[PDB]
């Protein structure tokens, strides 16, 4: 007797299990058990992943409903699962999205400056260097303090909530509420701080006192700061970290991008395509009976959209495991999702990785792992796949 297939399959972010392709071929929508003991449908082909993400009857917000089958426990209040919906309903979507583009004057130069300073300090200290804790994540943290308009020196404390805030846990996490409430109070103080006049929090602070927003809640304004800092920092820091591994593992590509850095954007788009940073499928709750491939998904059932299922699908991306800079469909991957909940920070995420990689290849053209790849320690029961340390030499 075998048990129902359990998800996630592997916390390793350096390789895709051979099992994903066998699943995609034989049963591209398959029943699985999550860590909570709930049943769910795991979707693993490009065609069916797109279908789910583009049909809003597969709901994000309803995943938070009491009594629903769960992928994992909430780490925030349930109303925050509908964060972007709440932002749109408050009339704030255009302003938020404008504040988190990489286009603000001086932003990209700040990113470059920060990356080079981080790398210079690593070089002064001498190999080995930890590219996650001492490059990718500080670069993400500094970027998001700038984007939000908050002091750089506040970044590290906000950052240290994230190893718990983005856990993928069977059960509620008492520390998540402690940190969440503290971080909300911090962001509420930011909104009252007259020195905070730039970035996203500077803009929200003005809109908060504009008569057209007088009935928007102070809680929502604070929540935008906490959620956009955490989602942004965890997503960019984790993506850049595992993209660096994929690059380091490909010396020919490393050398090509070093020699022809105008190809870095195409390279980053392929690194996004092959990225395993998301540790779980994206969850949706069916709000109707909906046919997905050979399965009639029933109202109230949990669906998990496996991003690397779509992104390594050979029917859509031939030779899917190979980084190819001349694909005809290069941004058609699902690294940023698709549909109603397509990532609002996609352009910022791209530029964070492009600038970080550009700076690394210039400063560290000989970069290589300083330990055998199997010695990386992959974080478990987390919403991202990331190595606890990334030791390199150059
Ligand atoms: C500064 C903010 C920010 C940054 C930077 C950002 N994200 Fe997002 N992302 C969000 C938010 C907020 C949402 C939720 C959007 C919604 O629900 O409409 C989201 C949504 C997503 C989704 C879809 C989730 C779903 O269930 O449909 C994916 C996938 C994603 N992000 C990946 C990434 C990746 C990969 C990166 C970086 C390489 C990144 N994000 C960077 C804020 C960000
Ligand atoms: Br938006 C935002 C930002 C910070 C957050 N912290 C806790 C939550 C709620 C759980 C949840 C549900 C659906 N998507 C997400 N994310 C966040 C990670 O990237 C993918 C989209 N998160 C939350 C939501
Ligand atoms: Cl409910
Ligand atoms: Cl500062």
Anisotropy-based shape: globular
Distance between the amino and carboxyl termini: 51 Å
Number of domains: 1
The number of helical runs is: 15
Which cofactors or ions or other ligands sit in this model? heme C, ligand ULZ, chloride ion
Task: Note the beta-strand portion.
Answer: 5-15%
Share of helix, binned: 40-55%
For the largest sheet, list the strands in their spatial order.
1-2-8-5-3
Order of helices and strands: HEEHEHHHEHHHHHHHHEEEEHHEE
Radius of gyration (Å): 21 Å
The SS-based structural class is alpha+beta
What is the makeup of the main sheet?
5 strands, mixed
What's the total number of strands? 10
Features:
monomer; 394 residues; alpha+beta; 15 helices; binds heme C; binds chloride ion; heme binding; Cyt_P450_B
């Amino acid at each position: 007797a075998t048990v129902l297939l359990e998800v996630p399959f592997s916390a390793r972010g350096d390789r895709i299990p051979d099992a994903v392709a066998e699943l995609r071929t034989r049963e591209p929508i398959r029943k699985v058990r999550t860590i909570t003991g709930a049943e769910a449908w795991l979707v693993s082909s490009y065609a069916l992943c797109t279908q789910v993400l583009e049909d809003r009857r597969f709901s994000m917000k309803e995943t938070a409903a009491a009594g629903a089958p769960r992928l994992n426990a909430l780490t925030v209040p349930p109303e925050v699962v509908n964060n972007m919906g709440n932002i749109a309903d408050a009339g704030l979507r255009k302003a938020v999205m404008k504040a988190i583009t990489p286009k603000a004057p001086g932003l990209e130069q700040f990113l470059r400056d920060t990356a080079n300073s981080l790398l210079d300090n690593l070089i002064t200290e001498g190999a080995p260097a930890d590219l996650r804790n001492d490059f990718a994540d500080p670069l993400a943290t500094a970027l998001h303090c700038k984007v939000l308009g908050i002091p750089q020196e506040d970044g590290p404390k906000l950052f240290r909530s994230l190893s718990i805030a983005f856990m993928s846990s069977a059960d509620p996490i008492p520390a998540a509420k402690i940190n969440w409430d503290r971080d909300i109070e911090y962001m509420a103080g930011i909104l009252e701080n007259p020195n905070i006049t730039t970035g996203l929090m500077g803009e929200l602070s003005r809109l908060r006192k504009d008569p057209a927003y007088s009935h928007v809640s102070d809680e929502l304004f604070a929540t935008i700061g906490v959620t956009f800092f955490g989602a942004g920092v965890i997503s960019t820091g984790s993506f850049l970290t595992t993209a660096l591994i994929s690059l380091i593992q490909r010396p020919q590509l490393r050398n090509l991008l070093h020699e022809k850095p105008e190809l870095i954007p195409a390279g980053v788009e392929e690194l996004l395509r092959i990225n395993l940073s998301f540790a779980d499928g994206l969850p949706r709750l069916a709000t109707a009976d909906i046919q997905v491939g050979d399965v009639l998904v029933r109202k109230g059932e949990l669906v998990l959209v496996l991003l690397e299922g779509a992104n390594f699908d050979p029917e859509h991306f031939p030779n899917p495991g190979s980084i190819e800079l001349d694909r005809p469909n290069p941004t058609s991957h699902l690294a940023f999702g698709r549909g109603q909940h397509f990532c609002p920070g996609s352009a910022l995420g791209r530029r964070h990785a492009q600038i970080g990689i550009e700076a690394l290849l210039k400063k560290m053209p000989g970069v290589d792992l300083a330990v055998p790849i199997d010695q990386l320690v992959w974080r478990t029961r987390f919403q991202r796949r990331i190595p606890e340390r990334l030791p390199v030499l150059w």
